[model samples]
Target: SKTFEVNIVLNPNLDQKQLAQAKELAIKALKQYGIGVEKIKLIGNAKTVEAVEKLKQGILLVYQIEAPADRVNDLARELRILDAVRRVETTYAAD
Candidate 1:
């Protein structure tokens, strides 16, 4: 059972409304691919407008999972096509 991490950079410019939508959308997207949100770390600076601006442009999120190594590529590809995702990276454990 290999474990991997998928880091996604979201597009910046997401307002509170958009942010909420993004979270729901992300959960649905991951679930579609058999992934779950074990833990989520969303950092907001108490500045929704600024936060959303950065989010709309680009922001980072790291998702951890225990899955077969072969699955990383497929997951990464799926994430890349997500509307809110700006970039994606999959990391496997070191031997």
Candidate 2:
């Protein structure tokens, strides 16, 4: 399997409660897509002025997974459907 890095950006408009709920749901989705917790990393919240003006704007998370290229695309597509998700990006490491 090839190792890939996945970055997920979540919507910043969510309140703390909503953010928690959305986060759990997102994690569940990731696990369903075969991402393990051990491979996940939290990159912290957005820091730009625009992001703070929007009240945090979003949370940034990165994770690694060993899967085919197609699976990476599938995960990105699936994550985008979640209300809290703003963006999903993936990059693979050199073999």
Candidate 3:
């Protein structure tokens, strides 16, 4: 199956509360698509949050989803509209 992705960015300033809240919201948002936490192809798990921080980037999470392009688009859109999201990227081949 071809895979698509959702990349979520954060400030990574060590505001653990904001991180937790943002994650909660994002997880809730993700579940709205009916997928679970274990299903995502978590790209950041390489070194976890440390990878993003070491990359001189904010707290970054890349979740690769295996679902319809339309759903991906909508989910990505909603995630971006989130107040906590510094930026959002949805990667799909659009087949």
Candidate 4:
């Protein structure tokens, strides 16, 4: 089986609690399919307008998850409506 790395960029409408919930839900959903969350990296909070500006120069996100390739896209599609996700991108690799 192959593994995948997925990046989900959030729209910034979420509070801390919502973000946490979304992350937890995603992990659980994936687990249901026999997939494990290998990593979940979140980058949040811009201290200054300039910092926010810099971050938004691209896209500021709430969280990202990595899972197995066979299940990654399905997980992303399933979690897209979980309250904070704006867009999702998936990258795949074999192990």
Could you tell me the lDDT of residue 67 within candidate 2? 67
TM of each candidate vs. truth: 0.67, 0.73, 0.69, 0.64
lDDT tens digits by residue: candidate 1, 24-69: 7766666766677886666533323433554533566666666676
Error of 2 at 46 (Å): 2.2
TM-score, structure 1 vs. true: 0.67
Pairs of residues clashing in candidate 1: 11-55, 11-56, 12-54, 12-55, 12-56, 12-57, 12-58, 13-55, 13-56, 13-57
- lDDT of all predictions: 0.64, 0.70, 0.65, 0.58
Q: Give the per-residue lDDT of model 2 (tens digit) for 1-95.
A: 57777777766666778767766776787788667777666645565343455555457767777667778778788767777766777789866
Best by lDDT: 2
Tell me the tens digit of each residue's lDDT in model 3 across 1-95: 35667778765554677777777788888877775677443332233353354544565766656666668778878787666666777777553
Off by over 4 Å in 1: 43-57
Number of clashing pairs per prediction, in order:
10, 1, 0, 0
Candidate 3 TM-score to native: 0.69
Best of the two (1, 2) by lDDT: 2
Which pairs clash in the backbone of model 4?
none
